[PDB]
Amino acid sequence: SLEIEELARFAVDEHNKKENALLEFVRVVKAKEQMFQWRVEFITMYYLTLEAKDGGKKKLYEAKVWVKAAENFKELQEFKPV
Amino acid sequence: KKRQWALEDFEIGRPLGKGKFGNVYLAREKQSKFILALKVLFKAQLEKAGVEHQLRREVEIQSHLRHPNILRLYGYFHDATRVYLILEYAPLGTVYRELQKLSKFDEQRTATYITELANALSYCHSKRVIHRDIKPENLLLGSAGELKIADFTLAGTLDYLPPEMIEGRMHDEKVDLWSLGVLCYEFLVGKPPFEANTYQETYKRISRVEFTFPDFVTEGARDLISRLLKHNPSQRPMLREVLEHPWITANSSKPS
Ligand SMILES: Nc1ncnc2c1ncn2[C@@H]1O[C@H](COP(=O)(O)OP(=O)(O)O)[C@@H](O)[C@H]1O
Ligand SMILES: Nc1ncnc2c1ncn2[C@@H]1O[C@H](COP(=O)(O)O)[C@@H](O)[C@H]1O
Numbered sequence: 053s054l055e056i057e058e059l060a061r062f063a064v065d066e067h068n069k070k071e072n073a074l075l076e077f078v079r080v081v082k083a084k085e086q087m088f089q090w091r092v093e094f095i096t097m098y099y100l101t102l103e104a105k106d107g108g109k110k111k112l113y114e115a116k117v118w119v120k121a122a123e124n125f126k127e128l129q130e131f132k133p134v
Numbered sequence: 135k136k137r138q139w140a141l142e143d144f145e146i147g148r149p150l151g152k153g154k155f156g157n158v159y160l161a162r163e164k165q166s167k168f169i170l171a172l173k174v175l176f177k178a179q180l181e182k183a184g185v186e187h188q189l190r191r192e193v194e195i196q197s198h199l200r201h202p203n204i205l206r207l208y209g210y211f212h213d214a215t216r217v218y219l220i221l222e223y224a225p226l227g228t229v230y231r232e233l234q235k236l237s238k239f240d241e242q243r244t245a246t247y248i249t250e251l252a253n254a255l256s257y258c259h260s261k262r263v264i265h266r267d268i269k270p271e272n273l274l275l276g277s278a279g280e281l282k283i284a285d286f287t288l289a290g291t292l293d294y295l296p297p298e299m300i301e302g303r304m305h306d307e308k309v310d311l312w313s314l315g316v317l318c319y320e321f322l323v324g325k326p327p328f329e330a331n332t333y334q335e336t337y338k339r340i341s342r343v344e345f346t347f348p349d350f351v352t353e354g355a356r357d358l359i360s361r362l363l364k365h366n367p368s369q370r371p372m373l374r375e376v377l378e379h380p381w382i383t384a385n386s387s388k389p390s
């Protein structure tokens with residue numbers, strides 16, 4: 053529940069920047085992680101289902117975020133209405 | 135047959151390879167003089183990665199698999215610091231190394247590998263075993279060049295994973311059909327189809343099933359790989375439909 057909730061706040065912010073939007077974060081519904089190997093490295097992805105307000109109306113989104121905790125790295129892969 | 139195994143049952147020869155958790159050695163059982171491989175795993179490095187749980191499952195599954203295209207686990211024993219796995223020896227090494235050596239495989243060698251893999255996987259699926267992680271480094275070659283599948287929150291290696299896994303959805307045995315598609319392409323081409331300079335790009339290409347073929351890949355091969363690499367798992371062929379695909383029957387060799 054802690055670092056996750058932050059991650060969600062970060063996903064919403066990155067969406068707002070990429071799409072010129074003004075979504076307001078509400079809460080995390082669900083959250084998963086998986087790790088992948090690529091070449092000689094390892095990357096985690098978080099799968100977050102979040103509620104956020106679009107023009108006042110609460111909606112459900114799924115974000116996928118890359119996280120390499122070691123190098124203080126995070127990056128929005130995708131952000132979609134459910 | 136044999137009540138129990140011990141290190142004293144084996145003459146040991148050269149190292150065959152260094153794995154993550156110990157080394158693999160050439161070995162020979164003393165009574166029969168049959169040549170085998172002995173894989174030594176250090177318990178400490180197994181704890182230190184909590185792989186132990188998987189080893190248990192590996193050993194128990196691979197114990198009950200009997201297939202010409204799956205590497206036999208004949209038996210096992212342990213001591214204070216080590217686990218020992220008594221394995222079928224694969225003298226011609228990994229497919230990974232052969233592909234590095236040759237760059238890419240002709241249609242006959244590929245189609246043969248794909249037949250052997252599809253037969254192995256069909257048997258597995260019938261035993262409710264899904265591999266989920268077939269890539270060239272987990273495929274070994276027997277004395278007649280026959281393929282042997284070796285290995286039974288880390289999901290896998292990105293380049294080999296299907297859309298349903300990378301996108302965190304539910305998945306089932308159809309994942310191995312995707313893998314077969316990737317492998318067939320990699321065998322023919324020399325690299326997997328979604329390879330990219332970033333993992334971000336690889337992720338996107340897989341999720342959108344965006345790949346193309348070089349111009350030497352034939353119509354038959356393209357037809358098979360394109361059926362295997364379907365976004366929707368439901369639309370991917372059954373393994374028995376791979377085994378009867380026209381490109382497979384025209385090109386595959388029959389077991390020695
Ligand atoms: N049964 C075998 N016959 C021949 N060589 C083998 C056999 N098992 C493993 N090897 C060799 O030793 C290496 C050890 O790898 P592997 O057994 O997969 O260990 P890990 O998966 O822990 O890295 C392989 O890459 C291969 O070259
Ligand atoms: N550390 C270990 N790693 C793998 N297998 C083990 C280990 N210790 C015992 N085993 C055997 O692995 C199998 C799993 O337990 P079981 O089959 O219930 O006896 C058995 O053959 C065990 O005795």
Ligand SMILES: [Mg+2]
Pocket residue numbers: 271272284285
């Ligand atoms: Mg391996």
